[PDB]
Design a protein around this nucleic acid. Sequence first.
DNA 1: AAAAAAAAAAAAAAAAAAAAAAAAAA
DNA 2: TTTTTTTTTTTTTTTTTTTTTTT
Lengths: 1318, 46, 49, 572
Amino acid sequence: VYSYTEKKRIRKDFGKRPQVLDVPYLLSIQLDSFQKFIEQDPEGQYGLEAAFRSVFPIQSYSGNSELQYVSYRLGEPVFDVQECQIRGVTYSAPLRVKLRLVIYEREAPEGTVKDIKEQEVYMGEIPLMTDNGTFVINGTERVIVSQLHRSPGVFFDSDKGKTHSSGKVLYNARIIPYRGSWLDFEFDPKDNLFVRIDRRRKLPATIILRALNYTTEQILDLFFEKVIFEIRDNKLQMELVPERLRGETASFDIEANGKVYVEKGRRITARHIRQLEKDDVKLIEVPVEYIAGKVVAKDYIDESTGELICAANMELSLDLLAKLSQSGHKRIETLFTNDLDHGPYISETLRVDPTNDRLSALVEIYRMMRPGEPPTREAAESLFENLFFSEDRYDLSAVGRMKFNRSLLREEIEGSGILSKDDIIDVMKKLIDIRNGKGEVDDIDHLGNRRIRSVGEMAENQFRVGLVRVERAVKERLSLGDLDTLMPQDMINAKPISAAVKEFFGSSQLSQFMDQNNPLSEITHKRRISALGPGGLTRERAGFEVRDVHPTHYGRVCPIETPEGPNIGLINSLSVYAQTNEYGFLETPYRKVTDGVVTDEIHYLSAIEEGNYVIAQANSNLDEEGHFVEDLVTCRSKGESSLFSRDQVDYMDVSTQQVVSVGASLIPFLEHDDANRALMGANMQRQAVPTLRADKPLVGTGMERAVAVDSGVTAVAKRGGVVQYVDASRIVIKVNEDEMYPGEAGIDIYNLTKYTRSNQNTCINQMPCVSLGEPVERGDVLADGPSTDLGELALGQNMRVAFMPWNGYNFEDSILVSERVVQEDRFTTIHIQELACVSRDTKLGPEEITADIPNVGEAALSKLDESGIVYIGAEVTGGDILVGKVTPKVKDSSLRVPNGVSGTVIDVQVFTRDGVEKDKRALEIEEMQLKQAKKDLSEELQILEAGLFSRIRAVLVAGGVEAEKLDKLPRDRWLELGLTDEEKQNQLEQLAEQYDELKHEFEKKLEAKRRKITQGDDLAPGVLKIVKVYLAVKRRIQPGDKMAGRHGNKGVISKINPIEDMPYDENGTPVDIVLNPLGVPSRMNIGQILETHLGMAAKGIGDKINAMLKQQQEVAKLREFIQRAYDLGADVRQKVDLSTFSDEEVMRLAENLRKGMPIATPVFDGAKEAEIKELLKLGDLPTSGQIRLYDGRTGEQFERPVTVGYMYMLKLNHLVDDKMHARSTGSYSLVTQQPLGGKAQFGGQRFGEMEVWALEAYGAAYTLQEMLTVKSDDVNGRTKMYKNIVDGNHQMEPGMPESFNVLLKEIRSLGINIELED
Amino acid sequence: TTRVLTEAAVAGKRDELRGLKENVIVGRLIPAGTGYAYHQDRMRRR
Amino acid sequence: ERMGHIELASPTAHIWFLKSLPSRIGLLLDMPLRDIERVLYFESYVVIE
Amino acid sequence: PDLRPLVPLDGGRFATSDLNDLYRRVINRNNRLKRLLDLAAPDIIVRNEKRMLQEAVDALLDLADMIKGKQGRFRQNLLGKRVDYSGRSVITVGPYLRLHQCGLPKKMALELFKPFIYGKLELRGLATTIKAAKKMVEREEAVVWDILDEVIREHPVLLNRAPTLHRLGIQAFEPVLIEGKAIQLHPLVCAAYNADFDGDQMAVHVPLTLEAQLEARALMMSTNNILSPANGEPIIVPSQDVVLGLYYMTRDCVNAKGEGMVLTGPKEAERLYRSGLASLHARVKVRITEYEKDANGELVAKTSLKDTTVGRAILWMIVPKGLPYSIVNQALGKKAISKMLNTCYRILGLKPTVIFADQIMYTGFAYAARSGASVGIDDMVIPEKKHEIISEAEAEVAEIQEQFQSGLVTAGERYNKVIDIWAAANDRVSKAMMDNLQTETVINRDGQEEKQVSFNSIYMMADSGARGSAAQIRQLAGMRGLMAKPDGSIIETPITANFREGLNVLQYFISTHGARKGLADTALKTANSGYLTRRLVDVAQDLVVTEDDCGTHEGIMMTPVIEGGDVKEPLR
DNA sequence: AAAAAAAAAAAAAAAAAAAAAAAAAA
DNA sequence: TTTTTTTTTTTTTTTTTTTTTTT
Ligand SMILES: [Mg+2]
């Protein structure tokens, strides 16, 4: 069973793989993140309260005055979303913080405060998230793109390759905070370990280690194990353990108990270790020479002298052995050195160390941080301490600690934000371990090392910055703290917080201006992950490893949608099911698998947890139980794939689509076409343009429903009901009584958005899609947004296409289009341009908005009203006047239409600074809006009263029913009728109180709306009034506009021929569009051909339905035919009968399918070759899919039958008339007298460096001189050339380039003397 | 710009204007193609 | 076309010759650039005659 | 001050360059220093003042950015200068054009030559004040169009693309006013521009002076550039659609209508084909006359019976006199047509070659249209051995895997063995698919049966060299082979599927691995190649041919190149 | 209230070149 | 003990637009 709204046109499907998890709310990312950003949640936990508790309470040092927090609230906005859109204000809400301030007395800190105060302090406003998941900033609609920034924690890298060109792989470790100074360590060819902070000057590492109050002896003992030589009367006998003997060549005989165990020169084999173990031989003898090469660990002193016998970290010898022997110290300690297991890294760094004591270390760090000043003891101490151990300038969040502990093999995941000596020590240990072989560098491209910041986190960061700024100011003013003469409204300044948050939301490399020329453009622009932005990399610093897809991108990032060119892979888009983990990592769904049963539950796995498990690929055959029918199944385990046994896999892919995104899952038959053109098409589909009639794409992928409903363009219902009143403007729904609350009953109203400017100047509009008086299901489409129909994403249009090279007009990729296409008004798009005129005040008088304008043809003034403004509907053409603005002197400075644009004014907004005179047409629009609001509120109240009194009638059906007395009097009094002692009388009294309350609310809300309208919409300072005219131009398709399919088969529309000369089949139908066959093989996308075949089949069934419906073939024939069509062969998830469909429903279905049957095709589980031929067989069309075509001109057959079907083709937002731009002679630039560039300015093209080279590559000299002297630069030259041209002479006068003289003057401005010679 | 201009200033190097890039800067005929003939005239004057 | 000028009360050392690497004044006087920079930045003294 | 203008923004504010701010700072600091010296301040305060003044002069001087940077005067305003009399638009194809001319939207024509139309109207006397001509052009008076046809009569314009790499990036063309808004382009010349019609935008410039007009017609005319400067290969090589039409026009089938007759000449061959009584190709004897200039530049006529094909005989009417006949007795693939144009250029000069190229484009497109060379899904057959070859490969890899499990071989040896056998099986599938395609046709000869070169659509479009090649067809029918994991480490589980069949999820993931690196390559490789070309032209700017001969005897030895095998590049 | 720098994000990768430090003498 | 050579290290180049701090 399906929603009747879907029963309107139920989409045929071919997906066999039974789904297990429905596509989630596609916008979960932004919506959930901003929900996290604002809600009353105690104990912080990633919310505003977290920031407040981080920075509050606030107290001055020993000031007896602390400033504590209570709670926060976000009151209502000042407008509603549409009102903000039209006016321009930010769709923001306040921040009422209950702030509590108390002051102590002198020497009573623990004692109770002498004073207490609390108030609802106000602190600026912040934007909120529209329902669709956007933000309105300055009247535009902006969405913030989630960033994929390098995750905090510890990460190790190799830095191999061209490092010294020696082949010596380096190693380095980085500790990255979520906020704070970085920490870096690296090795070198000398194998001396180093450290550096914020990529400043290199330093040894021991020096920083010693800065933690660590003695060199302590450092060596901590880093290295002990080797103990004991003086037993001679030879310094050794306590040898076998474990430290692997891979060693003994140059001296190793023996004990008088028995030789390793002969001189024989290397220690595993058998020798076994001997020393089983025999339990530990004490051994060594010669003096063997101790020469070792190194002392600690420092020793003599009994009498008490002086340094030997410093730590220095090689020994016989003389030194005697020097330490006279003292008689039995314990001789050394550190085990082995180039293959433990090298002398820390020892070498100690040798490189400059000094000894902690003070000199701190001095060195202080100088390094801020070079060129005197180091100081206390200042350096504080600097070092708070640089890493203070929340002031350091913090690792929970996820930072999670990564840190999971990369050091710790146990606890929760710890302190600041670091500690043990942490850096363990980092050193891990770095040396990986240097010695154990442990591996962490590939950064692995997703687990990267994380998705959403809007919530960025807004939290900027709010934190604002809060710390205001806190600093608060402390500064509390330093002047006075005796309760104030309430806490002067410590808190509004400017910092609002300034920071607004600066972020308005200017931000990530908070991009929204792309709105589609449903899909939004749905895939808010699910975009930008590697750029603050905290991430930049385009320049991106090698071909970050861009490349990592094999763990499976299930978490789409590999087939990224912008092409300057940034490939930096803007990877989110997957379909992929969501964000609590810690921010990218989790993806899977199906839990028991011994042999694929449990239908769902299990989300992170980027790292996946590797531990082995996961089975989506399309593995299972039969009614989940038991794989093959013992060996293709599965991926750890960044790789291979065949694995049936009883080895504990996880299975949920749906075959979880590799791709919404921006590419819609490409039908994607599995057939190459990755390249698939990516290009996926990018293209986001560039569609909403046409004049959405047309239900024939070959869809069943995701149209989700994108259309969740994109927000379609006014999806909220509570099921009956469509009482329908209209292009509003739709009224009578909610079912069971679905409606008992009190506050009312009804539902949707005000469909009409033609308004979209952010790319395309038209966004809605149309009713439900007939008057029809049921509607809760959460169903009611109005089809642009590029949608019946709640399905229809960007372009299905069109009859034929693949054949037709007379060379399809040379490279160009597309030939029959005149029939433009005649039927198929691609005709609506563009809407916004033009603004501002009326300011300046010296010599203000700028009036009158009509009286000197020296203008009266026909110009005809199109204006008496005020001097154009009417709603006067077709304007390039050059005419919209609004009459005059600069006092008086001179005409009226706004004019941009040159070269048609139009038909659809609306004119007029905002006026508060407290200024409203002009005639401004008063008229004021009255228009006033009347509209009055009508809306009045009809709301009237229909509500009608419903309430119908409820009263239903109540009065019993308990004093009086038919004659019911209609005797009007609806003025319906409570005076007789009733017994029943609760109905009380309910009638309740309904009368409700009626009075409704009257009062309608009156007061109408008053509020009238006040809103009356107060002239305030403007930026300095401006009097602004007027915006919308011109609604209509653009057909002309030879040079771009159109293309979904598989990236681009093409600019070439000569559109008359319908007569197009190829026509035997039946006579012309084929609308004649592509180029030669684009199939080289551009490896065979998907489009299968799509065309399926399109021909779909329209074959559509033609059959239309034929059997044109003829009266009641129910039976069409019922059986449709049922046959919907089953059609192998296993399908549809399994749709038609008995449930009443004959009315069946005929509605037939009517909506007469234009074709919408066929679905899940991306990789789609329709095979066998089923397409079967569908064609159900029709009356050739099985091969090729039909002979007759040439339009000659009228004879084409040999070798050609392919014709219905392919869905878009129109892309590159219209020729937007590009075609020329010039002859116009305004030049001021600083240099050169022609302007661009299109907005009436400019000219660029004769660039490359063009100059190409010119001089020929012998062409005069042309180059003309290009760069007389046509571009020479101010006097070009005027003379113009005058000569008008006189029929083509004479050139050289002169001199003006910009050349400008450069001469500029360089003379420096200390340079340049002149010209003879 | 820095190094070249510094060297030119210190050396006081007069510019001959013989190649093709400098002449484009000056805005006169390039001594490469047709303009070569014109140059063949002008060098003949001196 | 017309330019202007500022009469500077104190002479100013042109900066292009100061950090050209190799500085013109640098090897012209045969002294390291660090000492020249320190002297010009009023944090040292030099000997004249 | 003019070079540091105080531009007020759109309202009551001023937003000009930092130069004014730096000058204000310098003058303020100097005035403060003078005032303090008048006050005789302590040496410390005046020292700070002098240091601040030095900093201010440093900030004002380092102007450098105006002279430095990609947006400096030398690079943004002196070398690469925006120019009037310019325009741009999306390009589009047109066959009816001749190589020595390119289309032009009417609006851009009337907009670019506006000075020229005003002058022509003034001289013509139809108007006296230039404002009258202005109002005339604005009114779009029908007189203006005749003036436009007069000025455009023969007045070349430059059509330049965006990435001007080689000198061919700018070519002259005679405009031909056409309705619409797209710069119609000759198809052949497109190959030189590296311009495909997926929305690329080309700019139009207008030479003004008689020097420049003669300069454009004599050098930059598309006729004068049919041989590239890089090498002697023709650059007007017909590209993709013309070539397919020609190749389909001259290709023998075993039997068809008109097979086995005698024709008196090409004319009645055309008459027979167009009438439908004779197939477009059928091996047949005809009479052809060929002209040869073996004598001292004198044409000699020779005629006799030639065995040829009907479409081939029809094509023969387009070759000029001088060329031989055997040149068109082959299948006429892309390379054949290229060397055929080269022979025409070498033996007959230039003008015959231009006329011949225009005619070959016309007669290629027309018969491509007549061919209806479409591509349906049944035009690429999956060889039956694909399944069997794959199954044998699976058996072999499993055997080697268990051999490694027993410890007979190492992991590296097993990997190499598996990769090698997968490559061998891929080659086997390739050979099977090529054998299936190329000689698919098995038809009667008017007898029992016979095989011939296949007429399968994809094979025709791959063999002619129009688009794709053996490598590209291979993954349309047979297995894609073995794609590379992020670092070239070819996976030991190659893509056993092919595009005609379905691709499972993981194989598509691997293909994405293969293709994203290629796209990113393209991007950054182009970025670097731009700078390589920049240096290359910068270091060879001065060299201009100046002397006929230096009269020097020294030189370099020239020999064929052999690296250790066959000759890579012959001495010729 | 007026005047002034960039310490206040940022690092990649590679190369050219200058300054400092370390051999290896006689 | 000084001096020349070489090596190493530091710094400066190579394809969208200015507030905060001090006097
Ligand atoms: Mg292109």
